[PDB]
Amino acid sequence: PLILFNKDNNIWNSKYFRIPNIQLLNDGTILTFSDIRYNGPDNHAYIDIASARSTDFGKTWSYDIAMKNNRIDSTYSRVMDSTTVITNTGRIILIAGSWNTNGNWAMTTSTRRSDWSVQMIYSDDNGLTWSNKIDLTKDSSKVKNQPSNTIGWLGGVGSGIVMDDGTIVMPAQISLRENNENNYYSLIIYSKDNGETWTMGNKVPNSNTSENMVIELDGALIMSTRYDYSGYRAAYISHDLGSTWEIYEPLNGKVLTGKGSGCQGSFIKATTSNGHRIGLISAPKNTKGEYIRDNIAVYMIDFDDLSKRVQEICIPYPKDGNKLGGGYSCLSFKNSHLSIVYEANGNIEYQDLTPYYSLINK
Numbered sequence: 001p002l003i004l005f006n007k008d009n010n011i012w013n014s015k016y017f018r019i020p021n022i023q024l025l026n027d028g029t030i031l032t033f034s035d036i037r038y039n040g041p042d043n044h045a046y047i048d049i050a051s052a053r054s055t056d057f058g059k060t061w062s063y064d065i066a067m068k069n070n071r072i073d074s075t076y077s078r079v080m081d082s083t084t085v086i087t088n089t090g091r092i093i094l095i096a097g098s099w100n101t102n103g104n105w106a107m108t109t110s111t112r113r114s115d116w117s118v119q120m121i122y123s124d125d126n127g128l129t130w131s132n133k134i135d136l137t138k139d140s141s142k143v144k145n146q147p148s149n150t151i152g153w154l155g156g157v158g159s160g161i162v163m164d165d166g167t168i169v170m171p172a173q174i175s176l177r178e179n180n181e182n183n184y185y186s187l188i189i190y191s192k193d194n195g196e197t198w199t200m201g202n203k204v205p206n207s208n209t210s211e212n213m214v215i216e217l218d219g220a221l222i223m224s225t226r227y228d229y230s231g232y233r234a235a236y237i238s239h240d241l242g243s244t245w246e247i248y249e250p251l252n253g254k255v256l257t258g259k260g261s262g263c264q265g266s267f268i269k270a271t272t273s274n275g276h277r278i279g280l281i282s283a284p285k286n287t288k289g290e291y292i293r294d295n296i297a298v299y300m301i302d303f304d305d306l307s308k309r310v311q312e313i314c315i316p317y318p319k320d321g322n323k324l325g326g327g328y329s330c331l332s333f334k335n336s337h338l339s340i341v342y343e344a345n346g347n348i349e350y351q352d353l354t355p356y357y358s359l360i361n362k
Ligand SMILES: CC(=O)N[C@@H]1[C@@H](O)[C@H](O[C@@H]2O[C@H](CO)[C@H](O)[C@H](O)[C@H]2O)[C@@H](CO)O[C@H]1O
Pocket: 041, 042, 043, 104, 291, 322, 323, 324, 325, 326
Protein backbone atom coordinates (compact mmCIF):
# COMPACT_ATOMS: atom_id res chain seq x y z
CA PRO A 1 0.00 0.00 0.00
CA LEU A 2 1.24 3.54 -0.79
CA ILE A 3 3.09 5.37 2.00
CA LEU A 4 1.43 8.83 1.93
CA PHE A 5 3.59 10.31 4.69
CA ASN A 6 7.01 8.73 5.15
CA LYS A 7 9.00 9.13 8.39
CA ASP A 8 11.96 7.73 6.44
CA ASN A 9 11.72 10.12 3.45
CA ASN A 10 9.83 13.38 3.63
CA ILE A 11 10.52 16.99 2.78
CA TRP A 12 10.39 18.15 6.42
CA ASN A 13 12.75 15.45 7.74
CA SER A 14 9.98 14.69 10.30
CA LYS A 15 10.77 11.66 12.51
CA TYR A 16 7.01 10.64 12.66
CA PHE A 17 3.47 11.30 11.41
CA ARG A 18 0.12 10.85 13.23
CA ILE A 19 -3.60 11.63 13.03
CA PRO A 20 -4.36 11.35 9.27
CA ASN A 21 -7.42 12.88 7.57
CA ILE A 22 -9.01 12.49 4.12
CA GLN A 23 -11.70 14.11 1.92
CA LEU A 24 -12.59 12.82 -1.54
CA LEU A 25 -13.54 15.94 -3.51
CA ASN A 26 -16.51 16.08 -5.84
CA ASP A 27 -14.22 16.25 -8.91
CA GLY A 28 -12.08 13.21 -7.94
CA THR A 29 -9.38 15.26 -6.26
CA ILE A 30 -8.09 13.65 -3.05
CA LEU A 31 -7.10 15.85 -0.11
CA THR A 32 -5.39 14.47 2.99
CA PHE A 33 -3.80 15.90 6.11
CA SER A 34 -1.58 14.73 8.92
CA ASP A 35 0.22 15.97 12.01
CA ILE A 36 3.88 16.50 11.20
CA ARG A 37 5.48 15.27 14.37
CA TYR A 38 8.96 16.69 13.87
CA ASN A 39 10.71 15.25 16.93
CA GLY A 40 8.98 11.86 17.30
CA PRO A 41 5.64 10.31 18.33
CA ASP A 42 4.80 12.33 21.45
CA ASN A 43 1.65 14.46 21.67
CA HIS A 44 3.35 17.15 23.72
CA ALA A 45 5.91 18.28 21.16
CA TYR A 46 6.51 20.56 18.15
CA ILE A 47 3.82 19.92 15.55
CA ASP A 48 2.37 21.37 12.33
CA ILE A 49 -0.32 20.03 10.04
CA ALA A 50 0.55 18.93 6.50
CA SER A 51 -1.69 18.53 3.47
CA ALA A 52 -1.10 16.08 0.63
CA ARG A 53 -3.08 16.61 -2.58
CA SER A 54 -3.48 14.28 -5.54
CA THR A 55 -5.09 14.93 -8.94
CA ASP A 56 -4.24 11.44 -10.23
CA PHE A 57 -6.54 9.36 -8.00
CA GLY A 58 -3.65 8.94 -5.52
CA LYS A 59 -0.76 7.74 -7.76
CA THR A 60 1.23 10.88 -6.84
CA TRP A 61 0.92 13.72 -4.35
CA SER A 62 1.65 17.38 -3.73
CA TYR A 63 2.55 18.21 -0.13
CA ASP A 64 2.36 21.46 1.78
CA ILE A 65 2.26 22.69 5.39
CA ALA A 66 -1.42 23.65 5.77
CA MET A 67 -1.24 25.07 9.36
CA LYS A 68 1.69 26.16 11.50
CA ASN A 69 1.79 26.17 15.27
CA ASN A 70 1.90 29.51 17.09
CA ARG A 71 5.75 29.21 17.02
CA ILE A 72 5.87 30.38 20.68
CA ASP A 73 7.70 27.38 22.13
CA SER A 74 10.22 25.38 20.12
CA THR A 75 9.63 22.26 22.28
CA TYR A 76 5.81 22.40 22.78
CA SER A 77 4.14 24.53 20.12
CA ARG A 78 1.58 22.43 18.22
CA VAL A 79 -1.59 22.51 16.20
CA MET A 80 -2.91 18.95 15.81
CA ASP A 81 -5.79 16.45 15.75
CA SER A 82 -7.44 17.65 12.51
CA THR A 83 -11.17 17.73 11.86
CA THR A 84 -12.32 18.64 8.36
CA VAL A 85 -15.40 19.10 6.21
CA ILE A 86 -16.37 20.25 2.74
CA THR A 87 -19.20 22.86 2.68
CA ASN A 88 -21.93 22.96 0.02
CA THR A 89 -20.06 25.83 -1.54
CA GLY A 90 -17.15 23.40 -1.88
CA ARG A 91 -15.16 25.37 0.70
CA ILE A 92 -12.85 23.13 2.76
CA ILE A 93 -12.69 23.81 6.56
CA LEU A 94 -9.88 22.53 8.84
CA ILE A 95 -10.17 22.93 12.59
CA ALA A 96 -7.31 22.04 14.93
CA GLY A 97 -6.38 22.29 18.59
CA SER A 98 -3.54 24.64 19.46
CA TRP A 99 -1.23 24.50 22.48
CA ASN A 100 2.35 25.40 23.50
CA THR A 101 2.90 23.87 27.00
CA ASN A 102 3.55 20.34 28.37
CA GLY A 103 0.74 18.20 29.65
CA ASN A 104 -2.50 16.60 28.46
CA TRP A 105 -5.10 19.09 27.09
CA ALA A 106 -8.01 17.81 29.15
CA MET A 107 -6.49 16.82 32.47
CA THR A 108 -3.45 19.09 33.24
CA THR A 109 -5.17 22.31 34.48
CA SER A 110 -8.22 22.99 36.69
CA THR A 111 -9.12 26.18 34.88
CA ARG A 112 -9.15 27.21 31.21
CA ARG A 113 -5.89 26.08 29.66
CA SER A 114 -4.17 29.47 29.27
CA ASP A 115 -2.22 28.51 26.16
CA TRP A 116 -5.15 26.65 24.61
CA SER A 117 -7.20 27.60 21.58
CA VAL A 118 -9.03 26.31 18.52
CA GLN A 119 -7.67 27.50 15.18
CA MET A 120 -9.49 27.31 11.87
CA ILE A 121 -8.38 27.65 8.23
CA TYR A 122 -10.50 27.39 5.09
CA SER A 123 -9.84 26.92 1.40
CA ASP A 124 -11.92 28.24 -1.48
CA ASP A 125 -9.69 26.78 -4.22
CA ASN A 126 -10.26 22.96 -3.87
CA GLY A 127 -7.50 22.99 -1.26
CA LEU A 128 -4.70 24.68 -3.26
CA THR A 129 -4.27 27.44 -0.70
CA TRP A 130 -5.57 28.21 2.80
CA SER A 131 -6.78 31.32 4.58
CA ASN A 132 -4.87 32.75 7.56
CA LYS A 133 -5.60 31.07 10.84
CA ILE A 134 -8.84 32.27 12.48
CA ASP A 135 -8.98 32.04 16.30
CA LEU A 136 -12.31 30.53 17.42
CA THR A 137 -11.76 31.07 21.13
CA LYS A 138 -9.75 34.32 21.69
CA ASP A 139 -13.08 36.16 22.24
CA SER A 140 -16.79 35.31 22.16
CA SER A 141 -17.40 36.53 18.59
CA LYS A 142 -16.92 33.14 16.86
CA VAL A 143 -18.57 30.40 19.06
CA LYS A 144 -21.81 30.72 21.08
CA ASN A 145 -22.84 28.53 24.06
CA GLN A 146 -19.27 27.68 25.12
CA PRO A 147 -19.53 26.56 28.83
CA SER A 148 -17.98 28.83 31.46
CA ASN A 149 -16.40 25.78 33.04
CA THR A 150 -14.44 24.89 29.86
CA ILE A 151 -10.85 23.59 30.30
CA GLY A 152 -10.50 23.15 26.53
CA TRP A 153 -12.18 21.61 23.49
CA LEU A 154 -11.24 20.69 19.89
CA GLY A 155 -12.79 18.77 16.99
CA GLY A 156 -13.77 15.06 17.05
CA VAL A 157 -10.79 14.06 14.79
CA GLY A 158 -11.99 13.11 11.32
CA SER A 159 -14.66 14.71 9.21
CA GLY A 160 -17.83 16.70 9.79
CA ILE A 161 -20.98 16.66 7.64
CA VAL A 162 -23.59 18.93 5.99
CA MET A 163 -27.32 18.69 6.86
CA ASP A 164 -30.13 18.97 4.22
CA ASP A 165 -30.39 22.77 4.43
CA GLY A 166 -26.63 23.28 4.32
CA THR A 167 -25.85 23.58 8.05
CA ILE A 168 -22.30 22.34 8.68
CA VAL A 169 -21.85 20.03 11.71
CA MET A 170 -18.43 19.27 13.12
CA PRO A 171 -17.85 16.56 15.78
CA ALA A 172 -16.15 17.90 18.90
CA GLN A 173 -14.71 16.97 22.30
CA ILE A 174 -14.65 19.08 25.53
CA SER A 175 -13.07 18.99 28.98
CA LEU A 176 -15.18 20.52 31.76
CA ARG A 177 -14.39 21.28 35.43
CA GLU A 178 -17.11 19.46 37.40
CA ASN A 179 -16.96 19.26 41.25
CA ASN A 180 -13.15 19.29 41.57
CA GLU A 181 -12.62 16.80 38.65
CA ASN A 182 -11.91 17.23 34.91
CA ASN A 183 -14.43 15.25 32.78
CA TYR A 184 -14.33 14.93 29.02
CA TYR A 185 -17.36 14.46 26.76
CA SER A 186 -18.19 14.35 23.04
CA LEU A 187 -20.53 16.95 21.48
CA ILE A 188 -21.02 18.73 18.13
CA ILE A 189 -20.63 22.28 16.83
CA TYR A 190 -22.57 23.72 13.85
CA SER A 191 -22.28 26.72 11.50
CA LYS A 192 -25.13 28.23 9.52
CA ASP A 193 -22.89 30.69 7.68
CA ASN A 194 -20.32 28.54 5.89
CA GLY A 195 -17.97 28.38 8.93
CA GLU A 196 -17.65 32.07 9.90
CA THR A 197 -19.47 31.48 13.21
CA TRP A 198 -20.45 28.40 15.22
CA THR A 199 -22.78 27.23 17.96
CA MET A 200 -21.77 24.55 20.45
CA GLY A 201 -24.26 21.76 21.23
CA ASN A 202 -24.40 20.17 24.70
CA LYS A 203 -22.42 17.19 25.97
CA VAL A 204 -23.39 13.55 25.32
CA PRO A 205 -24.64 11.44 28.33
CA ASN A 206 -21.40 9.75 29.50
CA SER A 207 -18.05 11.29 30.41
CA ASN A 208 -14.89 9.57 29.16
CA THR A 209 -16.16 10.10 25.58
CA SER A 210 -13.93 12.09 23.26
CA GLU A 211 -13.01 11.74 19.57
CA ASN A 212 -16.06 11.01 17.45
CA MET A 213 -17.87 11.50 14.12
CA VAL A 214 -21.61 11.96 13.45
CA ILE A 215 -23.67 11.03 10.35
CA GLU A 216 -27.03 12.60 9.40
CA LEU A 217 -29.99 10.25 9.14
CA ASP A 218 -33.44 11.72 8.28
CA GLY A 219 -32.64 14.84 10.23
CA ALA A 220 -31.16 12.91 13.23
CA LEU A 221 -27.49 13.01 14.16
CA ILE A 222 -26.01 9.61 15.03
CA MET A 223 -22.59 9.68 16.78
CA SER A 224 -19.97 6.90 17.06
CA THR A 225 -17.55 7.87 19.79
CA ARG A 226 -14.34 6.80 21.55
CA TYR A 227 -15.45 5.75 25.08
CA ASP A 228 -12.28 5.31 27.10
CA TYR A 229 -11.98 2.15 29.27
CA SER A 230 -15.42 0.79 28.36
CA GLY A 231 -14.02 -1.58 25.70
CA TYR A 232 -16.33 -0.41 22.90
CA ARG A 233 -17.40 2.56 20.81
CA ALA A 234 -20.41 4.34 22.24
CA ALA A 235 -23.23 5.60 20.00
CA TYR A 236 -25.91 8.22 20.66
CA ILE A 237 -28.69 9.89 18.65
CA SER A 238 -29.90 13.54 18.64
CA HIS A 239 -33.16 14.78 17.18
CA ASP A 240 -32.44 18.49 17.72
CA LEU A 241 -29.07 19.11 16.19
CA GLY A 242 -27.07 18.08 19.25
CA SER A 243 -29.00 19.77 22.13
CA THR A 244 -30.13 16.45 23.59
CA TRP A 245 -28.83 12.90 23.28
CA GLU A 246 -30.05 9.37 23.90
CA ILE A 247 -28.17 6.09 23.61
CA TYR A 248 -28.30 4.71 20.03
CA GLU A 249 -28.78 0.95 20.62
CA PRO A 250 -28.14 -0.40 17.05
CA LEU A 251 -24.55 0.86 17.19
CA ASN A 252 -23.88 1.36 20.93
CA GLY A 253 -21.58 -1.40 22.15
CA LYS A 254 -21.40 -3.02 18.71
CA VAL A 255 -17.73 -2.22 17.76
CA LEU A 256 -15.34 -3.57 20.44
CA THR A 257 -12.04 -1.86 20.98
CA GLY A 258 -10.18 -4.27 23.32
CA LYS A 259 -8.53 -3.69 26.70
CA GLY A 260 -7.35 -0.31 27.88
CA SER A 261 -7.93 3.14 26.46
CA GLY A 262 -10.17 3.71 23.45
CA CYS A 263 -8.90 4.84 20.05
CA GLN A 264 -9.98 7.38 17.38
CA GLY A 265 -11.98 5.93 14.48
CA SER A 266 -14.13 7.14 11.62
CA PHE A 267 -17.87 6.83 10.88
CA ILE A 268 -19.44 7.85 7.55
CA LYS A 269 -22.71 7.38 5.72
CA ALA A 270 -23.16 5.82 2.29
CA THR A 271 -26.30 5.22 0.23
CA THR A 272 -26.18 2.11 -1.88
CA SER A 273 -27.93 1.60 -5.24
CA ASN A 274 -30.90 -0.18 -3.63
CA GLY A 275 -31.65 2.98 -1.59
CA HIS A 276 -30.28 1.63 1.75
CA ARG A 277 -28.28 4.02 3.96
CA ILE A 278 -25.25 2.18 5.33
CA GLY A 279 -22.73 3.25 7.94
CA LEU A 280 -19.07 2.38 7.72
CA ILE A 281 -16.72 2.51 10.68
CA SER A 282 -12.98 2.25 10.83
CA ALA A 283 -11.12 1.31 14.03
CA PRO A 284 -8.53 -1.20 15.34
CA LYS A 285 -9.73 -4.51 16.72
CA ASN A 286 -7.03 -4.04 19.42
CA THR A 287 -7.00 -7.76 20.18
CA LYS A 288 -3.46 -7.37 21.69
CA GLY A 289 -4.74 -4.65 23.97
CA GLU A 290 -3.96 -1.18 25.22
CA TYR A 291 -2.09 1.02 22.77
CA ILE A 292 -1.00 -1.79 20.47
CA ARG A 293 -4.16 -1.21 18.40
CA ASP A 294 -3.62 -4.15 15.99
CA ASN A 295 -5.84 -4.63 12.85
CA ILE A 296 -7.50 -1.42 11.65
CA ALA A 297 -10.79 -2.87 10.31
CA VAL A 298 -13.82 -1.62 8.43
CA TYR A 299 -17.27 -2.56 9.57
CA MET A 300 -20.66 -1.93 8.08
CA ILE A 301 -24.20 -1.56 9.32
CA ASP A 302 -27.37 -1.20 7.20
CA PHE A 303 -29.75 1.38 8.70
CA ASP A 304 -32.47 0.04 6.42
CA ASP A 305 -31.96 -3.49 7.77
CA LEU A 306 -31.19 -3.19 11.47
CA SER A 307 -31.72 -6.83 12.38
CA LYS A 308 -28.66 -7.79 10.37
CA ARG A 309 -25.56 -7.68 12.62
CA VAL A 310 -22.65 -5.31 12.04
CA GLN A 311 -20.23 -7.01 9.74
CA GLU A 312 -16.48 -6.66 9.33
CA ILE A 313 -15.84 -5.84 5.69
CA CYS A 314 -12.04 -5.98 5.47
CA ILE A 315 -8.92 -5.20 7.52
CA PRO A 316 -6.88 -2.58 5.57
CA TYR A 317 -4.12 -2.71 8.15
CA PRO A 318 -3.89 -6.28 9.45
CA LYS A 319 -0.91 -5.45 11.60
CA ASP A 320 -0.01 -4.49 15.16
CA GLY A 321 0.18 -0.74 15.57
CA ASN A 322 3.24 0.97 17.01
CA LYS A 323 2.78 1.32 20.78
CA LEU A 324 4.29 4.84 20.61
CA GLY A 325 1.30 6.04 18.60
CA GLY A 326 -0.81 4.24 16.00
CA GLY A 327 -4.30 2.89 15.12
CA TYR A 328 -5.98 6.12 13.91
CA SER A 329 -7.74 6.13 10.53
CA CYS A 330 -10.13 8.05 8.31
CA LEU A 331 -12.64 6.96 5.65
CA SER A 332 -14.07 9.17 2.92
CA PHE A 333 -16.93 8.28 0.60
CA LYS A 334 -17.92 10.27 -2.50
CA ASN A 335 -19.59 9.37 -5.79
CA SER A 336 -19.42 5.61 -5.25
CA HIS A 337 -15.76 5.68 -4.25
CA LEU A 338 -14.30 4.79 -0.80
CA SER A 339 -10.77 5.65 0.41
CA ILE A 340 -9.02 5.29 3.78
CA VAL A 341 -5.90 6.85 5.35
CA TYR A 342 -4.37 5.32 8.49
CA GLU A 343 -1.35 5.10 10.78
CA ALA A 344 1.25 2.37 10.08
CA ASN A 345 4.46 2.24 12.16
CA GLY A 346 5.04 6.04 12.18
CA ASN A 347 3.91 6.49 8.58
CA ILE A 348 0.55 7.27 6.99
CA GLU A 349 -0.57 4.78 4.33
CA TYR A 350 -3.34 5.27 1.79
CA GLN A 351 -5.69 2.78 0.09
CA ASP A 352 -8.63 2.93 -2.30
CA LEU A 353 -11.31 0.58 -0.88
CA THR A 354 -13.80 1.13 -3.71
CA PRO A 355 -13.64 -2.58 -4.66
CA TYR A 356 -14.97 -3.35 -1.15
CA TYR A 357 -17.79 -0.87 -1.72
CA SER A 358 -18.69 -2.67 -4.99
CA LEU A 359 -18.89 -5.92 -3.00
CA ILE A 360 -21.32 -4.22 -0.59
CA ASN A 361 -23.23 -2.48 -3.41
CA LYS A 362 -24.06 -5.75 -5.30
C1 LIG B 1 -0.34 4.37 30.25
C2 LIG B 1 1.10 4.83 30.26
O1 LIG B 1 1.99 4.08 30.61
N1 LIG B 1 1.38 6.07 29.86
C3 LIG B 1 0.35 7.01 29.47
C4 LIG B 1 0.31 7.52 28.04
O2 LIG B 1 0.80 6.58 27.10
C5 LIG B 1 -1.15 7.82 27.74
O3 LIG B 1 -1.13 8.72 26.65
C6 LIG B 1 -1.53 8.30 25.33
O4 LIG B 1 -0.38 7.64 24.80
C7 LIG B 1 -0.59 7.09 23.51
C8 LIG B 1 0.68 6.36 23.18
O5 LIG B 1 0.49 5.58 22.01
C9 LIG B 1 -0.87 8.23 22.54
O6 LIG B 1 0.27 9.06 22.54
C10 LIG B 1 -2.09 8.99 23.04
O7 LIG B 1 -2.38 10.12 22.23
C11 LIG B 1 -1.93 9.47 24.48
O8 LIG B 1 -3.14 10.03 25.00
C12 LIG B 1 -1.80 8.54 28.92
C13 LIG B 1 -3.30 8.49 28.89
O9 LIG B 1 -3.78 9.58 29.64
O10 LIG B 1 -1.38 7.98 30.19
C14 LIG B 1 0.01 8.17 30.39
O11 LIG B 1 0.38 7.85 31.68
